[model samples]
Target: EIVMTQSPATLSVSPGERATLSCRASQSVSSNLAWYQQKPGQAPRLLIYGASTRATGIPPRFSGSGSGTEFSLTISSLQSEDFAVYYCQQYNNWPAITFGQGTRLEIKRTVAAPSVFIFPPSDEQLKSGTASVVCLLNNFYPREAKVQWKVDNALQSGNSQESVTEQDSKDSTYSLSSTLTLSKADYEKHKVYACEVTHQGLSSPVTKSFNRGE
Candidate 1:
């Protein structure tokens, strides 16, 4: 059986907007395609089948069209009730069925700028000539934001590591943390370190500065 994959694991949008979702198959499924919408703890609802036919009870705004190995599902004008995960399934191979990994359609809203904090090493460690600092990012959204560190106003390319972004299921926001390990001498010499965050919805990069003293 051919495998299917959905691009853009997530789509963020607001109500009354339009959203286009895609599905791809490893091999041609011909017109034996179907699209479904699944909500939290609810059964999946068929939206489209046979490539373009609207399933029973599906709203006119919900439509699908495509052929060969590529297919698309478009929502003309999104409604709040439409927020859910969508999946594409292949019916060409009857007995055995395959579904593309679902794509989540999220409702996008104004997200507050991320706040950065630095956790400097304890006083005892600071005196030992070896120390590290952690840069924490909080209150971000979409979980697709980027974070990088800088030393003395220049980018820090080495000896730094970042954690995977975590999303809050209850609110759909995000939080993540990164760490920069440095020698006591280097920390003192650099004096200034910063964390920069970038997101699609933001007008500009959000940044927070940290000094070794604080």
Candidate 2:
């Protein structure tokens, strides 16, 4: 799968200042663009881009409007050293998509910058008796993403899996998927099963959980 990553590691800014964030796709994305902001130790909050449309309760200082594969996230005026990590994503299509690693914005020269991370989906449990579930990480961000599984909380790596790559529109998004084979016993043992995505641009990765109920 094609992967999207970010650079500069950190950004320096001041209160009442203006900033711009950049996200690049592994392939060319025609016009599927998205942006988001995240505070320390929190989930990524949408900012601007193809839903260039504004969100409710957002400060006017934040503005986003872009097309094609490239997009920008701008803060008209800074609030406090309360700078956060930012990312750009593309939603061109499905199956394969990607997100940029986050950009850390800081104040002056302090070493108090926080790191952003995307959580990936859980592993494919193909035992017996459990409900078979397939997770399609198809949130097209016009970039490439990875797929893996985790047990309990530890990462399960080195399993042979299929990886495919393709291009869509001008900016091709990355894609991948994970499957969970459930057994009746599994349902009783674990309270719930979760699928996590660790994209670069997100302040925190997203997850979809499954359980006995809904």
Candidate 3:
């Protein structure tokens, strides 16, 4: 059996330029290799098969070449839609096909900064003597972000927790939220509670507040 290795881990590229992705096998796999492309929240799409054969529906800009232990997937010109993960698989490895770790192709520019929304506990929940505040991050790109809860303009590291980011199947953007819970008496005392978000899309980190005084 053989293993397939993909290089660079990530390949950053701009739209309208060419991209070359490399894949190598530990042992000769002949021409039984296939290449697949995957977008976030989507299944991998076959791009190359039998080492150099193009899959049906694949564009002419997409091409695969080489044989045996080395191969490359080349895009003649990158489209914005072309930014995705690519991987190689060698089927000649007998009982199991050898798969390569995917290489992420990222856009050189950041796109779609998230919008922030903060929700304070409703007055109806005041009867419980405790309240929860939530900060939502919506419609972001590249799926990497961090959030922190702040009380009285100071970080509250242990007082809050963030949810896992999820990609919207309808649009491919990412969304997540962080929640902070505290005694209602504290909430009334501290009018300035906020959530700070940092992401590549922003030139500076953003913060949104849920104020009780207003």
Candidate 4:
């Protein structure tokens, strides 16, 4: 029945470098420690347990060591996808379980940037006086992103809604869409509409602009 604490708060490392993450408990947990890795916008994965045994399916580069109240999860060679937050949990106390504050493994360089697509109201929909424009973002890695909309050069915040982000199972990338509902008068008057996308991979926001069509 003790609290677990992690060290360094953040571990900056590059691919192929050796990384050592630490965890300490308030009292002896007797090698009952387990380690988990959590990537941005994804679930945490078990990497080590029993303070020394690798979890099933974990690679050889990942190893655990130490016992009692002090333990560590070591990665001999970091991979591109290994940049994430790591946590340690104690199971010896059962129902009174606790986890260490996460340590983030940040990469020095940026990766994949998101691709953006904007769909304006069709001619038929505009003519019928019922229209909604959609802005889609795809192929982004690390799964963290933000979407913003503008109408006639001014930010349009209230009329826009977003869908839940979906991850691609194949490559761990993510995609999502935002919708902006507009009345006929608003659509007619606002000839220019834009969608702005921001992600960790980009140095600045990417924007796609649309014009009202016939």
What TM-score do all the candidates reach, one by one?
0.54, 0.45, 0.76, 0.66
**lDDT per model, in order?**
0.81, 0.55, 0.83, 0.83
Candidate 2 residues 83-102, lDDT tens each? 56777666675555567788
Q: Summarize candidate 3's per-residue lDDT along 1-214 as a digit string, tens digits.
A: 6878999889877667889999999988889999999987889999999988999999989999989888999987676667678999999966697789988876544477999999988778877898889899898886788898888887787778778553443444678888898888888887688889999889999999867767
Best by TM-score: 3
Lowest lDDT 10-mer window, candidate 4?
A: 164-173
* Model 1 steric clash total: 0
Error of 3 at 36 (Å): 0.9
Off by over 4 Å in 2: 1-5, 49-51, 109-214
> What local lDDT score does residue 49 receive in model 4, on the 0 to 100 scale?
88
Regarding TM-score, does 1 or 2 come out ahead? Answer: 1
Q: TM-score of the candidate numbered 1?
A: 0.54
Residue range 42-142, candidate 4, lDDT tens digits:
89999998988888999989999988988888898676578678999999999788999999876533357888999988878878886799999877766
Evaluate model 3: give its TM-score.
0.76
State the weakest 10-residue window (summed lDDT) of model 1.
164-173
lDDT of 1 by residue, 110-207 (tens): 56566667677677888888877777877676567677787888887777787754344445556778878888888788778887877765788877
